Each structure stands twice: as structure tokens, then as C-alpha cells.
Amino acid sequence: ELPDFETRCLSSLSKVFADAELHDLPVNTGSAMWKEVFSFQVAYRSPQLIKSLKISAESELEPYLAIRAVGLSPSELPVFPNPDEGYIRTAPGLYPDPLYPLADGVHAVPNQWRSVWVTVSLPSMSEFIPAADIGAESVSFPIDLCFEDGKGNHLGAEKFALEIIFQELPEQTLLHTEWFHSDCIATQYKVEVFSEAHWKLIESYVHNAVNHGVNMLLTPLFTPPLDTYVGGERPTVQLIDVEITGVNEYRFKFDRLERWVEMCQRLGIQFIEFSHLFTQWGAKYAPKIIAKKDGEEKRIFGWDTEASGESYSLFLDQFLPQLVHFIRNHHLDDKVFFHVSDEPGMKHAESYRQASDILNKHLAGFSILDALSDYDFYEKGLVQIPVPSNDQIEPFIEHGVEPLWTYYCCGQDHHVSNRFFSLSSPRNRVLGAQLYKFGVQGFLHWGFNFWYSQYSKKVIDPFKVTDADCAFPSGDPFVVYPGADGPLDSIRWEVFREGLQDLRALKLLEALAGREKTLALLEQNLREELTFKSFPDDIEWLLSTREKINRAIKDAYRA
Ligand SMILES: [Br-]
């Protein structure tokens, strides 16, 4: 006689822990637009150990549907000291995060809730395979999920009803970069940088990025000078070929950059974000730069070459005009961004100025972006486009700074949206609504796939170490895991795309009904105005808000 077995259908916004009771309420309905990725999960529990469950879905949406297992990752540093009351947990342990192919095997483990995650990637209406009335406002499709043991006995089932609203979620216009660490791919898969095997993996990772709303890619002219200790290095990742012809004299080749840019174009990246040309913590030094003299490679710049020295000045006087010629020849003039150095403090205003001044002699007319969360520094007029943290953005909104950009990282641990393991899925997804309300033009994140320790002192295994060796709250350094042939998603990466989908849906309702009505619907029944710091951290609020937006779109009078 069969083991006992229970199921509960849930939204994408639950995190099901294997060591706790499940309080979440069942969710068996939702709505979506064409070209939207709609996700849900089913939790299940048995008192027995049941190995290699057979899980299947039956739906007209089967061509668009994937099922994955929600795996557990360790976190030794889930929180910084004194986590606010909105954290879902504070103790080290195992957290639901990675999403594994079902082919990898799925088990019921005694008296533990586990989950399977369902992704429905909807096409355009014109590509949809099932018959659907082109004149309907929406059509509902059942999705039935079935659990059986290894030997074909039925254990459980859940039915989900997805309503597809017959309008398209419009193309994303928000600029969105998640810094891509090519080096981390090379060291994890054990391939040489810019080998053909490395290029193939790069393509897989970029494809995943684009699919999750990344339209701007960090482009390593020289080894990005990021997360490296003073006097330290990361593996050489350098698209520019440099030949030393004599003292302070160079020649350049851009053929590997041209390969990179063509890859970007082909995979759907729209903007090229060139890597920083000076070090972190005040732009005092050059990046690591490698050059050939007489066939042989040597390091010509780095932590022993001051950024304000004439040597690095003369190098950029030769390089930058040649990069500008490349840009113009490839019709990239309005598609590029440059970086100086992030978050210069007031004590570094002078070194930042001297660095920024070098670029300004050559890069007139181009967008130059830098993380900058201090409005008093911004008033000095040294940074062109500031990228303030979402916990520091208030004075940039108050003063009408344009274009408005935001980021978050490990430092944004209080109140605001983030993507830590120990934070709820609503506190991730709500970013979409905040971006909408404040008219943000771009969002930046440092950690697509950062798989080293703090300061890149060692390589870590991201399946075992999720906090960069007790430096950053787990979830901060990476949203993808290394699968055998390409990325594995986290539930947090799926939920972040949902926030970008909410932004796109809000902008659609704005096109149909205007901004005043859209913003009023979004803030209906809130006790406090929506800000980057103040929102309901609540599954029911967010789901019912997006459902209202969808119904208002469905009901809108259309041209
Ligand atoms: Br958008």
C-alpha cells in the first residue's frame, strides 16, 4: 500500500523550506500576457522516502512548459548584523535556490516539504500552436501536474488555471546590466580564456542573460579592475591586443572586440558597456594590461602604474581615439557606455577628477556611467551619469536627475529591494513597480555569476559557497549556477524577471489609460506611499496588484 503524499499549488513568490511547516496559502490561478514567462510551483511532502518520482504535466501549453526541482543551497552568512524585521529567516542552513533539470532525479524526503517549479514561456499570439480565438479578450488553459512513484502508482496532482490575456507584453526599454564575469566561467569549467570552448560557454551564459531582460553587457577591453585586492589580480580577460613598438609606443588590434560585439548583436544585447579603465577605491591605478614585446607577453600596467602618471595617460591618448574609430566604423555611436571607477568618496575627488579628465579629452559625446550614492559629490559636477544605490536615491529623485539609474549590492541590506536568500520573493519582485513609479531608465547589478571569494582571493564552488566565503549575504554575488553545459537558474533570477515583466505591464497600462490612472491603481489601498524603502512585503498584495493591472489592460479601450 502506497505512502501518504500531499501537495499544495503555490505562486512563484513562495520559498518552500525543507525544515519547516508550510503556512503559505494555495494558489491555483493566475494571468499572463503573450510573450510573458509565467511561473508557479507545487510543494509536496511524504512521511516516507520515495526516490525518483515521475512528474509530468498535461496541458495544451505543454510545448511552452518546463518542470524543474527546487534544490537546496547552503548559506553560512545569510545576514549582516542586525537584519530588519522583513527577513524571512536569519540562521545559517539550507535555503531553496537552484533549479535542477527533472532528468537529474526528484525525491520525496521523509517529513520534508520540497517543491517543483513550473515555467511557461509564452510565445507571441501569431506563433501560438493551440487554436485560440483571435477575437477573445483572454482564454484560460488548465495545467495538470501529476506525481507518480517509480513504478507508475499515482501519488498526487494539482491543477492550475492560467488565463492568457490577448495582448503582448511590450519590449523592454529599461536598460539592464548584470555584470558578466568571463573569468569565472573559464575557471569553473577549466577552459582557457577565449578558447573556442570558452566562447561557446560565453554564448550560453549571454543567451540566459538576454532571456532574463539583460540588454547591456559588460565588455572587457582589459581585465575588469573589480573585486580585486590591491596588489592582486584576476585571470587575464582582455579583448584588446596590445603590441609595444617602443617606450610609451603601442599598436592595437580590435578583431576579438569585433567578435564580442557581433556575439552581442546576434544574441540580442543592445548596448555595450566598456569595462572600467581605472581601479576601485578612487581611480588611483590602472587595470592589469598585457602587451607583446617581440612575440612575448608582459604586464605593462596595473597596481604599480599610477592612473595620473604620464605613462598610462600616453597609453590612453593612443588607445582611446582608435577605440572611437572602431565604435564609429561599427555603427555603435549611440549604443556604448564607459566607466571610470565606482563610488569615489569625497577623499578621492582629486584622483577621480584626474582620471575622468583623461577620458573627457577623448570621449566627448559618449555616455559615462559611475556608481555614486552621494548627492554632495554629484553637485561637484565630476560624474556624468550617476548610478545611486536604491537606499540612497531620494535626493536624486527630489532634484530631477536625468537619466535616472539605480543599483543594489551587499550594502543595501535595510528595507529596500534585494535578492538575498534570506529575503522574501516579494521584496525582490517589487523592484519592477518602484522602477515604474520613479521613471528609472536603467538598473545595474555587479553579480550575474561572480564565483570567487571577496577580493577574488580564491575560486569557490557556488553549489557549496553562496556568500563569497562569509563576505556577502548569500544571493548577492550570483543569480546563476554552473550546470554541466551552461547556466542553471535560481528561483531569485526567475523572480527578478517577474519584476521586469511587471514594469513592462505597468508601461503598457500607461500607454492605454495614462500615468495618473496606472499609478493610482498601483497605490490603491496602501497605508504609506510606495517608495524604494516602503512597500507591502506580502505575497497576496503583489499577486493581487499584478492581477488588477492585467485586468485593467484586458478591459482597456484600444486603438
Ligand atoms: Br521596460
Residue numbers in the entry: 18 to 576
The authors write:
Among Groups 1–4 and GH123, the DE motif is located at the same position, suggesting that these enzymes adopt the substrate-assisted catalysis reported for GH123 MR-β-NGAs.
The NgaBf, NgaBl, NgaLy, and NgaP2 activities were similar to those of GH123 MR-β-NGAs, as they only degrade linear oligosaccharides with β-GalNAc at the non-reducing terminus. The strict MR-type activity of Group 4 can be explained by these two loops that completely block the −2 subsite, forming a pocket-like architecture at the substrate-binding site and thus preventing substrate entry. The structure of NgaDssm (Group 3) bore a striking resemblance to that of NgaLy and NgaP2 (Group 4) (root-mean-square distance of Cα atoms [rmsd] = 1.5–2.3 Å), while the structures of NgaLy and NgaP2 are identical (rmsd = 1.0 Å). The increased number of residues could potentially reinforce substrate recognition in Group 4 and GH123 enzymes.
